[PDB]
Amino acid sequence: MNRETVITEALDLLDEVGLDGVSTRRLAKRLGVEQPSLYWYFRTKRDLLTAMAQAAMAPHAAEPLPEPGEDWHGWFLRNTRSFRRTLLARRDGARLHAGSRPDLDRVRRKMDFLVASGVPERHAQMAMLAAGRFTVGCVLEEQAEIDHESAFEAGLALITDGLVRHV
Amino acid sequence: KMNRETVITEALDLLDEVGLDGVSTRRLAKRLGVEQPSLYWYFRTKRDLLTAMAQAAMAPHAAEPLPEPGEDWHGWFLRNTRSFRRTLLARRDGARLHAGSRPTADLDRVRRKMDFLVASGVPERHAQMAMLAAGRFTVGCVLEEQAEIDHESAFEAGLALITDGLVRHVDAR
């Protein structure tokens, strides 16, 4: 028993009872251990959830990283389709994702490909946030049935500018 | 004086105060200075209380003027999404409340907004997708700020919109 073991059990438990059934009490019970041993590793419920959300994203890493020279545009579509499938495959995957803060190296790597393909740093960043937040919203709704303002505005302009193109 | 709108308004104020994770019938009862079972008659369950709170939370968005023929559809589009954002941010954990108990949209208002976009020359299918994209994007944005037609098709179209808007900033040099 260590952090990985706890997180793997927690994910099993999420698969079995959905996000609302996930608690430090039920998880300790499951591990055949009492609560303090579990509170060694995660001090709050939100530490646990964060670790689970970070661990639940591992399958997105089944996507090959971009290759130098390849179409940034086709890549960006694949990469976002992968992001959506990851969240969508996991029970309450989007709520798990949205209920915590977040392969940071893997993100920088993908950002460098984008910058090399001629998307300026600021736009690469905004485009990747926009796409992810849109995906979070999309899947959350599917599964039910820091300058945030300037990030919102940049994402919104992307959408609307995409639309202007069909008018 | 006990009154449904009153209870709901008091619940949304409670939400502002304690966070969504702190909203309970017992806590609302106490804010109101009443016996907790007296609230059962308004909201049989916590689920029903939330649904009601989520619906009332949208009123400020519904209070906005509808678009009129002749106005710039482009500026209105931005303005509409800015309104939706502002609405969600107006109550603490506003976007979790929304996402958790999806309110029912005014079909009359949704149709008038859509008609305006179509009469402005936006092709219908694209207007619909844009409108879905814009909303879903705003939920995801606001969720992250505050934390601090089939779904497949809609996802694909909203993603192409985003990626298309990016093309203009691209310069391979």
The CATH architecture to which B57-173 belongs is Orthogonal Bundle (1.10)
Tell me the CA distances in angstroms from A27 to A2, A8, A9, A15, B125, one per residue in order.
Answer: 14, 11, 8, 13, 47
- What does the alpha-carbon distance between residue A154 and residue A129 come to, in Å, rounded to a whole number? 10
Tell me the CA distances in angstroms from B99 to A62, A85, A128, B28, B127, one per residue in order.
Answer: 29, 20, 22, 21, 22
Which of B88, B104, B152 lies closest to A152, judged by CA?
B88
* The 3-state secondary structure of B44-100, one letter per residue: CCHHHHHHHHHHHCCHHHHCCCCCCCCCCHHHHHHHHHHHHHHHHHCCCCHHHHHHH
A117–B169: do the CB atoms touch at under 8 Å?
A: no
A118–B163: do the CB atoms touch at under 8 Å?
A: no
Structure resolution, Å: 2.2
Q: How many residues in total does chain B contain?
A: 173
**DSSP code at position B35:** -
- What does the alpha-carbon distance between residue B133 and residue A135 come to, in Å, rounded to a whole number? 9
Phi, psi angle pair for A125, to nearest 5°:
-60, -55
Neighbours of B110 (CB within 10 A): 12
Domain boundaries, chain A: 2-55, 56-167
Task: Tell me the chain B residues in contact with residue A98 when contact means C-beta distances shorter than 8 Å.
Answer: 96, 99, 140, 143-144, 147
Give Cα B148 distance to the centre of its chain.
Answer: 19
Dihedral, A49, A77, B162, A56 alpha carbons, nearest 10: 0
Domains B1-56 and B57-173 agree in fold? no
- What does the alpha-carbon distance between residue B57 and residue A27 come to, in Å, rounded to a whole number? 35
Task: Tell me the chain A residues in contact with residue B166 when contact means C-beta distances shorter than 8 Å.
Answer: 76, 119, 123, 127, 158
How many angstroms separate the most distant Cα atoms in chain B? 70
How many angstroms separate the most distant Cα atoms in chain A? 62
From first CA to last CA, the distance across chain B in angstroms is: 69
- What does the alpha-carbon distance between residue A154 and residue B53 come to, in Å, rounded to a whole number? 30
Which of A75, A61, A80, A62 lies closest to A132, judged by CA?
A80
Task: Tell me the chain B residues in contact with residue A23 when contact means C-beta distances shorter than 8 Å.
Answer: none
Q: Which residue of B has its CA nearest to A100?
A: B147
From first CA to last CA, the distance across chain A in angstroms is: 59
Give Cα A32 distance to the centre of its chain.
Answer: 30
**In CATH terms, is domain A56-167 a member of 1.10.357.10?**
yes
Do A26 and A16 meet the contact criterion of CB atoms below 8 Å apart? no
Tell me the CA distances in angstroms from B58 to A60, A132, B20, B79, one per residue in order.
Answer: 35, 25, 16, 16
CB-facing half-sphere around the CA of A62: CA atoms within 13 A: 10
B137–A133: do the CB atoms touch at under 8 Å?
A: yes
- What does the alpha-carbon distance between residue A17 and residue A157 come to, in Å, rounded to a whole number? 39
Look at residue A101 and give its three-state secondary structure: coil
Q: Write the residue in B139, B163, B169 that is nearest to A76 by C-beta.
A: B163
B165–A160: do the CB atoms touch at under 8 Å?
A: yes
Which of A116, A112, A117 lies closest to A72, judged by CA?
A117
Neighbours of B63 (CB within 10 A): 9
Residue range B1-56, CATH number: 1.10.10.60
Domain covering A2-55, topology: Arc Repressor Mutant, subunit A (1.10.10)
Q: How far is A1 from chain B (nearest CA, A)?
A: 31
Dihedral sign for Cα A53, A58, A64, A66, please. Answer: positive
Q: Which residue of B has its CA nearest to A71?
A: B172
- What does the alpha-carbon distance between residue A163 and residue A138 come to, in Å, rounded to a whole number? 18
Q: How far is B9 from chain A (nearest CA, A)?
A: 26
- What does the alpha-carbon distance between residue B56 and residue B45 come to, in Å, rounded to a whole number? 17
Tell me the CA distances in angstroms from B74 to B7, B12, B67, B162, one per residue in order.
Answer: 39, 33, 11, 16
Look at residue B36 and give its three-state secondary structure: coil
Task: Tell me the chain A residues in contact with residue B121 when contact means C-beta distances shorter than 8 Å.
Answer: 167
